[PDB]
Design a protein around this ligand. Structure first.
Ligand SMILES: NC(=O)C1=CN([C@@H]2O[C@H](COP(=O)(O)OP(=O)(O)OC[C@H]3O[C@@H](n4cnc5c(N)ncnc54)[C@H](O)[C@@H]3O)[C@@H](O)[C@H]2O)C=CC1
Ligand SMILES: [Mg+2]
Ligand SMILES: [Mg+2]
Ligand SMILES: [Mg+2]
Ligand SMILES: [Mg+2]
Ligand code: NA
Ligand code: NA
Ligand code: NA
Ligand code: NA
Lengths: 494, 494, 494, 494
């Protein structure tokens, strides 16, 4: 049950958000954001740069001052505010889902039923943590009373990508606000609209000015200004491995701010011969193609045991050929366009790369429409470990199917990667599942399922896929600064 | 009750430790380690460099392979091994305390009663954590069973300083080994001997080859090779803020290895007018002069309330004048030499700066002996916040005494620093203690005490004094990689 | 800012609540509930007995069956339902606060600002815990995967008193529902109305039928039927020490159901000579007189240091003399009537005993009105430890002031009691505060405050004041049944 | 590799242990303890009664007074003492194993390799918990600092059975001492020797006098005196359901002391048709026959799916017939005698009942030797749910094999019991394992294994099999009394 969408939602927010108010960039510069389904400009947005970031950081620092409304507010009340924000987002769910689709390209039905639902669940989950992340009382040696206070890390710079605009914003705001930090968020230049509207809801919810500040703009400018800022205490980043390095270097070169990163991957989806065929085929399709293939944890290396390889491939190809590509506002559409021209070209390049290196093109492989950035669902068979399409994140509707013989062999091949964000195993056998979940070097291992996220379960990468974890109780660790208080007492007793 | 020290303990280990074997450097080069009390060379030590680090990392990686003895060992058994190492260290306590003094300069009585005791307590505390750092079972939405596995982060690079050679080594090995990680440690060129001898005990305790590897050598060579290694998963560093930046940049520039840092500070020790005079004077003396002033958390900014300033200063000067400086092996010696000539000259430079900038030299101020690196206990009065000696870490027996009037004033002055490792408050008033402990921006706030460490309580810095925490349950966080396993189940029930 | 109350609120619910439906007692019998301010009957209420409890238990058991809506419901959704129930209670806040006052006697202003506020806070706090009480993954020896599931204890019998009708219902429902249990609640015969209306809100909120069942009626009938029921898995009781014994014996004699108890106390409020006089006097007054003295943790033993005894007593008498007793619906009323005639007479009897035993009657001591159960605020001075009023819980507006000399002395006298629910310490000294808080044998120790409750902090008794804790994370322990699952795996690795 | 046993170990301790000293009973009475293998008296043991328990409780209370050596001792030192005790038990391992076998009857090889190993592991595990069971710092509403202290519950009465004398003592002492409590232990009259010798080791290890007191004697006398004592704060009991009831009633009728119970069971072991036959048969044999069938969690209801029933039974009967019964000191003996004449007769009675009720006797069924309490390994086939041997705990070498058809059917049958201590599932299917482990109403569910205990994983029963959990972190909960300290502060900040 999905409410009919407004296929041309009006844009109400397109400026820089600081101290609960809207501002043009100091330079007065604006940049166009494009609708990927048509290739047309939606509207212009204030182009924030260093000077704007400076104003936002000063506002955040002021809201974080000892004795301020945000610092004195009961933890339980921060929880109330998050719950209020969630209620406001739900009130505007239909509008937000349509705006998300307009700026990003994902199907409206998905923006509505998936993205928005997950935003609401993330915020509501974290609202509950606001007054429950306890410090400790410690039985230290000697005549002392020792305890720890879980204080906020402080001014948190949050840089997010364009694949899940609203959800990425919620994943960042939820834990940061639940623990009493203040935020300077830099949204993606490709999808700034939905996050800016949410800023209006943050003000409406009652958050004190300066608690959340949003600066739309580009990376090397606004993003880098946050990473290198001398008064930003912590930075959280989700995006490319390349920029992840740039961020960590900027943090180390400036004030040693704390850093957490969520980068991409080349996640292996292992299908054992005893797996439920119909289920594994559908889930492998979902694992790769979901969100136009623009998922950090996309199952981009589909390993299939030799005995079921031929049948698995045949079914996967049929499924890929039936996938409906089109207007994301049409209910029948399964796949919208890629986010922008840059990604579009990059994917075309990877497809040509696959053909050049000898991977068997089974279907698709080309542009799916004249207007917009639509690419045909593409499947490569007989992919080998050394191929570039088997190693690098394509971030498009391009599936790699690899053949394997033994469970010991597949463990080694799946783990032979600098990435380690996620992995999956499809099998009916108890021992195979436990052997593989333990052996796989990945942040999340799904068993007989894929892309199953819960606000309660942590997510993050091993190796080069990132550091730190988001979601769950773990998502609060990077937003907390630990203080030990040790007091001399007359006579310590147990 | 301290056993007679061997004033010239024999050196048994002076090479690179890899796979439980001793190796010369690939280059065959060695460097001299000096006795700071005489300025004479104790012995030569293998000079490890990049190639030696590469050998160590490969050995560590092999020992960490799935199915290896270290990976399969019961968690409780890792605890047994840590307890066995502790027992071996206790057996060789008299010898290790003397060797520590010889290479570092600290008083033998202190090496024996403080350093060795703390090494033993740290290892025994962490031995207990080996089989108790649980993952979680999570009530995720939908028909799934979700849980987390707390796995070891992997190959851990550990770079440590010279101020507490043995203790720093135990603070690093304890949590790392308790959680099943493998180590490549780079000890300080000024004090490599005791850590190398402990490597012999690690082998004797029964730890599998490659679990702990030690590479003595210089920083820009061996240290940087670890920080920039493509196969090191995590790096923990303790030392200068300058090198802390270098380490974080190296991590970002290489493989995005996880990073934790423990840097210096300029910790404020606050004496309110209602403090117990005698206690505060002795504690402030200890707070600054302990370990030849070579403590990351030295109370180097002694703020004294105006009403008790004159008396506090008088008593402090008397205590500093009575402090016995001399041969560390003599039972009457309270202060040994500084670690090396570089530190020695750096401190004298700071003292000359203090004099030039207008601080009032109350006592000391010069060299304490013709041989070795001895410096007279120095006290500066009427110190102002803008003075060099009030801003920069001196790391020597140089005390700064500043005057203040109000509690709000002292809070602001204490917090006006880029450092935030520790702080202390001496007062008899409940409210003043609670106000200050909450307001101070420091990792550890001591109340009516100073330098009170316990393996049970975390330690680390705010701001530029570091990131991450060591000791306590918190010390296990940076040594754990979290994996989420989400399994589809027939029908989830509470 | 309190909304004008309806001094004669209409009663909508007065029957037995089972399976989201209203039922008359099987016997068809009813009992009157009286307005303590006038002594008149408000209305009749179904008199539940054993047969009614049996129907309730069967309904709860059915709702708890594996595969039922309540068992399969996402933990996060149980949280949504608790939040919805809180929203409904807030919508009807004015009405419920009035109904509470009518049936109980407490001032409407307090019912509204305190009771209803705490009910909302408690339900909202527990709503947040619903999907966060994790089980554990455990590093057991051998080739096994071991973990724990935190399952609901099951059918929970909850017997509550009349002093805080709504709050007590919330304290019970919150943790029980957050953890997925089902409830058979027996409300006090003196104050059944507000809880019965909340039952209507539980249905409106959407809780499945049978999840919460409420049986109004007497103790030896309905109460005992629950405690002795062969199919009730856990019983939680709040009330007299006498009935607490009966409950534990019934549990042991039946099916060994789990038991938690919150009984009375004779809590010591200790005023040191260095305390803030004005604050201590007002807080000591509140500590004893709050809610007509009908608080389990009432500071009924006011220990005052000899140097400030006279002045403290004088100020306390003046405050007690000016305390407004009258119609609870009038905004100026500070104290309403005692709950019923039985309590009224028992309190007067204690006052008579106090006079007989030699305590100095300083003010009050008799009936405050001709109609209703109003008693004058009474203060006894020079009370001795051996006096009946110094040992037994009076549960009325009767204050005992005792004199002491030393801190060591007061610890012994404060601890010489079979009760140990709470205690307080008023002092400006840090060491005295820590010395006493550690030494006092009580579940809650307040320092420079009293009756400070938070849904985040646990509450419960030491000794005969009870067992187990309510509120906070601890409040979930007694509502969870722990299951260990240990699975054989091919090869265990860290 | 088991050291040759002394088949006639000398007895050194046979009196009441109070204040680290040995005492005769006040009455001077003694009782004989018998060697079940021969029926002959080993020696006389002091017969403790109420008066001796009173002396013990006073000693424990004195040792628990604020300021005493035990109360002031650093928590880490409590860990050192537990580790020291384990070292002494390990030193005397061969002796203790032989004495255990002599008094209890179990094979020496098992006493040595299993019981003693588990005792050592349990004590060393808990030694590690001594300084790690943290309290909390809580973000309560308002201007307050609120935290909890995890204090010792106090004087703990521990009543243990005769099936695992040394292990049961360790399971009780480990958590109790790790948390700073004092103990009054009542060992089983059938097996008092090993526990008494351990008391000598407790003294040798350095535990303060009164911390551990042991009173050998009968149940209705010494045991009941502990359960009803007005100065015992908590009682932990392991034994029959019948006495568990008596204990809880005694607690409720006396001082409302806290209670935890570990009672019997009639644990179901479910073999699905897809199970590994060889492994399932061996494990089912072990599950039932381990320790002469004297295990609380014995797999006494072996459910076997119909398709594999015939083969499973034939293999089971073959294994039972080959089980070697004889002198427990002989290396080839798998089964020793039952603990005493009472159990011996009770088991023969259950066998008679099995024959009378129509269960198919497949092997054994009678006495296995003319001297000693030896019983033949007995197997009953075609057992039905309504049979006495299918419902009551036999506690002997008598196996019940039942046939089932579907997974839904077996869940209902397995759960249709007033017991719920443990259960097991043997299957290769991932879904069947998860479905069953979730559905079974038991404290511990083993998958493809049985009797897998670890000091790290909790153990306890559902329903009438008990309340509370032992082992793991959970084992510390019942030995902790929670105190909330809430302090008024000038201004609370996050
Ligand atoms: N859960 C278990 O592991 C065990 C269960 N049992 C069950 O109990 C059945 C009967 O064996 P029993 O030796 O008679 O067990 P029991 O429950 O009577 O005695 C066990 C312990 O409780 C003490 N005790 C006995 N009567 C007491 C009383 N009135 N008050 C306080 N303590 C008392 C005993 O002296 C011994 O220390 C066994 O056949 C078996 O079914 C027996 C041993 C262990
Ligand atoms: Mg880029
Ligand atoms: Mg340097
Ligand atoms: Mg009564
Ligand atoms: Mg018995
Ligand atoms: Na766009
Ligand atoms: Na040296
Ligand atoms: Na009433
Ligand atoms: Na015996």
């Amino acid at each position: 049950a999905v409410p009919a969408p407004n296929q041309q939602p009006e844009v109400f927010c397109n400026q820089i958000f600081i101290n609960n108010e809207w501002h043009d960039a100091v330079s007065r510069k604006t940049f166009p954001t494009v609708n990927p389904s048509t290739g047309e400009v939606i509207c212009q947005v204030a182009e924030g740069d260093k000077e704007d970031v400076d104003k936002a950081v000063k506002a955040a620092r002021a809201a974080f001052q000892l004795g301020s409304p945000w610092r004195r507010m009961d933890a339980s009340h921060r929880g109330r505010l998050l719950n209020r924000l969630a209620d406001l987002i739900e009130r505007d769910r239909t509008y937000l889902a349509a705006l998300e689709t307009l700026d990003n390209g994902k199907p409206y039905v998905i923006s509505y039923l998936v993205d928005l639902d997950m935003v609401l669940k993330c915020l509501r989950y974290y609202a509950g943590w606001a007054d429950k992340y306890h410090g400790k009382t410690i039985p230290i040696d000697g005549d002392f009373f020792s305890y720890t206070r879980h204080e906020p890390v402080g001014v948190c710079g949050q840089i997010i990508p364009w694949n899940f605009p609203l959800l990425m914003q919620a994943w960042k705001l939820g834990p940061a606000l639940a623990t009493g930090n203040v935020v300077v968020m830099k949204v993606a230049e490709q999808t700034p609209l939905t996050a800016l509207y949410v800023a209006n809801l943050i003000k409406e919810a009652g958050f004190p000015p300066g608690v959340v500040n949003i600066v739309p703009g580009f990376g090397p400018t606004a993003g880098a200004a946050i990473a290198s800022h001398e008064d930003v205490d912590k930075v959280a980043f989700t995006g490319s491995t390349e920029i992840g390095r740039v961020i960590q270097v900027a943090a180390g070169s400036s004030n040693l701010k704390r850093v957490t990163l969520e980068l991409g991957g080349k996640s292996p989806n292992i299908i054992m011969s005893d797996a439920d065929m119909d289920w594994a085929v559908e889930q492998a399709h979902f694992a790769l193609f979901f969100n136009q293939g623009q998922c950090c944890c996309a199952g981009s290396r589909t390993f299939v045991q030799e005995d079921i390889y031929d049948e698995f491939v045949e079914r996967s190809v049929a499924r890929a050929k039936s996938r409906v590509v089109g207007n994301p506002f049409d209910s029948k559409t399964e796949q919208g366009p890629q986010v922008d021209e840059t990604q579009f070209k990059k994917i075309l390049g990877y497809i040509n790369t696959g053909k050049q290196e000898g991977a068997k093109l089974l279907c698709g492989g080309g542009i799916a429409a004249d207007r917009g950035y639509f690419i045909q669902p593409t499947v490569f068979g007989d992919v080998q470990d050394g191929m570039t399409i088997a190693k690098e994140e394509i971030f498009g509707p391009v599936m790699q199917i690899l053949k394997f013989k033994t469970i010991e062999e597949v463990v080694g091949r799946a783990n032979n990667s600098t990435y380690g964000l996620a992995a999956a195993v499809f099998t009916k056998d108890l021992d195979k599942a436990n052997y593989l979940s333990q052996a796989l070097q990945a942040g999340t291992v799904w068993v007989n399922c894929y892309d199953v996220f819960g606000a309660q379960s942590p997510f993050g990468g091993y190796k080069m896929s990132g550091s730190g974890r988001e979601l769950g109780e773990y998502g609060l660790q990077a937003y907390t600064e630990v203080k030990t208080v040790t007091v001399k007492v007359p006579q310590k007793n147990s």
